[PDB]
Amino acid sequence: LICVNENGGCEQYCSDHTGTKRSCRCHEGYSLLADGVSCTPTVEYPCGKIPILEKRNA
Amino acid sequence: IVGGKVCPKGECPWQVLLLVNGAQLCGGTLINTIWVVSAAHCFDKIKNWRNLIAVLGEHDLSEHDGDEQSRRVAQVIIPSTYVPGTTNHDIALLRLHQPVVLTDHVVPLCLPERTFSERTLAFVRFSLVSGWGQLLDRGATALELMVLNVPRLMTQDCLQQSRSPNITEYMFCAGYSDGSKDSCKGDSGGPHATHYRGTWYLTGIVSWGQGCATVGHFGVYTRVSQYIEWLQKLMRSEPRPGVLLRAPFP
Numbered sequence: 001l002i003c004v005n006e007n008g009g010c011e012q013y014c015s016d017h018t019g020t021k022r023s024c025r026c027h028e029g030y031s032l033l034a035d036g037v038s039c040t041p042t043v044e045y046p047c048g049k050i051p052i053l054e055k056r057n058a
Numbered sequence: 059i060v061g062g063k064v065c066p067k068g069e070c071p072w073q074v075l076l077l078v079n080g081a082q083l084c085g086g087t088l089i090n091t092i093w094v095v096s097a098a099h100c101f102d103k104i105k106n107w108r109n110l111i112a113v114l115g116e117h118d119l120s121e122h123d124g125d126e127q128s129r130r131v132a133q134v135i136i137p138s139t140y141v142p143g144t145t146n147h148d149i150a151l152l153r154l155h156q157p158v159v160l161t162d163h164v165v166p167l168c169l170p171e172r173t174f175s176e177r178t179l180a181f182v183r184f185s186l187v188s189g190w191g192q193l194l195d196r197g198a199t200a201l202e203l204m205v206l207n208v209p210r211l212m213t214q215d216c217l218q219q220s221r222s223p224n225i226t227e228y229m230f231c232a233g234y235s236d237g238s239k240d241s242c243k244g245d246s247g248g249p250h251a252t253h254y255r256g257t258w259y260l261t262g263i264v265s266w267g268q269g270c271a272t273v274g275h276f277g278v279y280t281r282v283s284q285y286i287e288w289l290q291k292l293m294r295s296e297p298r299p300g301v302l303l304r305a306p307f308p
């Protein structure tokens with residue numbers, strides 16, 4: 001996996017590393033799940049999420 | 059915004075309204091509790107830097123509903139490369155005097171990493187632009203916050219499809235050449251927000267164009283990906299006396 005294709009499979013941010021290595025990362029207010037790709041909020045009002053819609057779909 | 063719709067209250071929670079002596083100046087985008095991104099050109103005619111107010115949680119300008127939060131603008135930071143009265147480098151970073159309180163109605167838009175924005179977000183076709191600008195060319199501005207979905211063009215395609223400033227590497231075109239749908243003057247500074255896998259990001263700033271939803275012309279937006287490292291560095295800096303700060307770019 002390389003970050004230039006399909007975002008390296010990362011939900012958010014992607015770093016290429018020496019090897020066939022890739023590390024996904026998350027914005028502040030999120031944490032990376034054990035899948036190594038997904039980001040889940042760690043705070044009530046993470047950036048880029050619309051609370052009245054997140055609660056509409058909870 | 060021409061040819062959009064009302065943004066349902068709370069669905070554009072990063073939108074900022076900038077006021078000068080109570081009068082609508084421009085939009086902006088909240089990216090953290092104390093930081094707002096707007097357009098440099100918003101500030102070309104400011105005389106008293108101390109009467110600039112940012113409002114978060116605004117929706118209907120005709121009423122107070124208690125979700126609004128107003129703050130003084132403590133710092134307006136503009137890239138050294140921006141020249142007043144011209145189009146390039148049209149970005150400003152505003153430091154609020156006190157943080158906003160995040161609520162259902164006040165939420166920052168994520169400022170993406172450069173690589174992510176360049177490699178991924180730049181290829182998401184549609185993105186939302188919003189503001190309280192003119193609903194028509196030569197028309198009244200909106201009382202409720204408006205929002206429009208606009209498709210982004212590669213600049214080579216914008217130049218081909220358009221028919222006067224260059225579109226530089228610090229800009230991108232988005233919208234429609236058929237005169238139906240655009241952002242306009244009074245939306246300047248507001249967000250061009252891009253969704254990717256469940257989260258929204260800041261990709262552009264309403265910057266310039268011809269007229270407003272003018273046939274043959276697309277909206278032009280500051281390419282925020284060019285400024286991520288500039289912004290991040292400034293957000294780690296101590297405030298300096300005096301509202302306006304010109305900061306080296308790159």
Ligand SMILES: CCOc1ccc(F)c([C@@H](Nc2ccc3c(N)nccc3c2)C(=O)N2CCC[C@@H]2c2ccccc2)c1
Nearest residue numbers: 099102144145148241242243265266267268269270277278
């Ligand atoms: C970099 C700004 O450059 C320019 C150039 C021309 C120009 F019309 C604008 C105006 N902004 C926009 C933004 C988006 C537009 C779009 N999507 N479609 C069509 C037109 C649009 C116009 C603007 O702010 N003006 C115009 C009248 C005084 C005021 C001003 C302009 C400059 C400085 C201060 C105030 C900015």
Ligand SMILES: [Ca+2]
Nearest residue numbers: 117118121122
């Ligand atoms: Ca209101």
Ligand SMILES: [Cl-]
Nearest residue numbers: 041042043044
């Ligand atoms: Cl939480």
Ligand SMILES: [Cl-]
Nearest residue numbers: 294295296297
């Ligand atoms: Cl410093």
Ligand SMILES: [Cl-]
Nearest residue numbers: 107300301302
């Ligand atoms: Cl000052």
